[PDB]
Design a protein around this ligand. Structure first.
Ligand SMILES: [Zn+2]
Ligand SMILES: [Zn+2]
Ligand SMILES: [Zn+2]
Ligand SMILES: [Zn+2]
Lengths: 215, 215, 215, 215
């Protein structure tokens, strides 16, 4: 697959929509405000459209390395704020994945250059849950660190002024923390779903509980 | 489409892969370093996998509002640096789209809150090409502003220390500026493709030329 | 001057305040909300307290390389927002300086590494005012580029959602663009002072006018 | 103190340098690369020149709200990188202060708007040292949280790719964590001084030890 290839395939794909689905065109222009925001990893091993079944333009998308929501990341925050305040998305989904190359680089910690700074946000979390991970077998640790990372970005997100003020306003917005692996492509809801500031706290704690309970 | 729905569809989608394509699983785990980085808009009216035909994990993805590459955006830059220096992607693609909601909000300029700051980076460009746009008909202006925005983010990207140092190192990396609309889903190469620092300049100018030539 | 030196001098400085000015202590604790925000360059060849005469804690301070106010710089913006919305500063001052090492590095353009990305925000401005600079003698260009940079950060600042919403709210806040050199330490008001959205535009244009008028 | 006032005082201050210190001018132009970087709080209750005794232009300065060094803060990082790689500063100093308005707002947690996001980086630390603070009296907690914040930004800073790569290169750079209050203006070295990656770890731990030892 080189460039002339994708250009060629595009043209033909576009022609053949006429016989497969012309309305694919017309579903998009009518309406189409998306109802969901998806925050994912740039690894994007499986595309959210395919995972979920959603048509495109029911979705609004942010993808950074390891699907982080840093407190002061104006890029990601700008996506969220537009999504919540302007497109009035009903749900937001942070999806991680087992085998995440950036979760991995945080842990193994090679000298990769500029990215290592971004990954320090992951090592912070790994530290934060040291004890928890200590009490479980090493085989299960990396993947648990994926689940913890999602869960923490869910926590971060509900703490943003954007979400705080939206919930207090009476806007109906729910946050989710999912993960999947490429062994099956099967979603695992991490149980951190947050419909307000109270449930954000409860369910943050609940889910950390269930990792510290099961292990 | 509510949440229980996507969870349900996911499970069934995942089961049915066994009969449609079990290898979908095994193509991913072997290898799979992606060869392409895609920078797009969070609007994501058409997913890059579908536009292009690429399998997932031939792609690495960044999506922000109006597919900007701001000089000092550590989020987007962190994606690029990992992509170029660590995954050694061969190509990078910045894809815009006609009807881009954020290109639109820059122009019409409503009070949307936090996002307006991000969109100031677009109004800067619109100003920069005032004369050029002045010499063409108003019907063609918004869409031309999409093309200009892509083209400028291509210019920005080749100016990043990351790209500058990669090209000087002898790494083989090419930048593209595409756009598409949902009228047909058909890609338009904007002709700004840059294989080094010399071609970045030539083709930046070349493409601005062809807008100022055709109009 | 090594470390033991500053620690030693500090102790003695602190003791000797008793005889020079004990109230220096008590002016600070009462009140002291500052009335001015100062955005400067990290070069800080002359400290704002000394330039201006202000007591400390009449001032609130941000210093980055070449005193930029980037649209999406959450650090600088966070300073401004707290200053304007919480401390209710009455004035904000962006001060540049002739001989600014970072204005210089933008122009001469050496490979310095990470910083070069930040300085691209300066080369953008230098481009924006190419014609203007072209019509004047080269001897006067670098220093004029300092004045232009200040002036543009003043323009940027009044365009921030923070300032836009503050002015529309009825809050009384004025923006200034100053510069000085170390030949005399003498301030030059660049005439871009902005008490609202209307005066921001007028005086942006006014001052660019006077550079394009005088030259 | 209004604007005409500072302009007037400036002019007169500048004239009167001739009789107080004309060389103040000529010390600056010769050389003057600074040997120290100072990272402080925008509160800037006491200016570093006065605290320390340093002449201006022995210093290079960054001031944000509560003197944070966030992993992904390109503004602050850009200052550090230029300072360390280009000006070859020998020392870097992070100075906090007791009574810090932003440390305070993190704790009390009022709805101040945009700034609250920046302050989440402080509440993270406060959490991180919950136990430690729990074992001491409440009267001593806020001020201890200042010391912890400095100490953590010192830790963050030595973890930046910039510092990591500089130390490994053989560059001679030392990090300090100081604090002061306006009761006396007296510096307290927090004992986190780091001359390399090994001493960064030792002394991070050492200093946390001495808070957990003394209390
Ligand atoms: Zn990943
Ligand atoms: Zn768009
Ligand atoms: Zn400077
Ligand atoms: Zn403070």
């Amino acid at each position: 697959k080189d460039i002339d290839t994708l250009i060629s395939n595009n043209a033909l794909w576009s022609k053949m929509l006429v016989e497969e689905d012309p309305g694919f065109f017309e579903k998009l222009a009518q309406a189409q405000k998306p109802r969901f925001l998806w925050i994912g990893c740039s690894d994007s091993r499986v595309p959210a459209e395919r995972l979920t079944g959603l048509e495109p333009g029911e979705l609004f998308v942010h993808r950074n390395v390891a699907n982080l929501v840093i407190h002061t990341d104006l890029n990601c925050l700008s996506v969220v704020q537009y999504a919540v305040d302007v497109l009035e998305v009903e749900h937001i989904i942070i999806c991680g994945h087992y085998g995440c190359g950036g979760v991995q680089a945080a842990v193994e910690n090679p000298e990769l250059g500029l990215i290592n700074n971004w990954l320090l946000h992951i090592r912070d979390i790994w530290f934060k849950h040291s004890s928890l991970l200590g009490e479980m077998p090493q085989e299960r640790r990396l993947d648990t660190l994926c689940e913890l990372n999602v869960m923490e970005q869910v926590y971060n997100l509900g703490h943003s002024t954007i979400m705080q003020s939206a919930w207090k306003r009476g806007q109906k917005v729910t946050i989710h923390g999912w993960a999947y692996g490429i062994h099956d492509g099967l979603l695992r809801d991490l149980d951190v779903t947050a419909t307000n500031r109270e449930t954000l706290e409860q369910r943050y704690r609940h889910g950390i509980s269930n990792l510290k309970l099961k292990h």
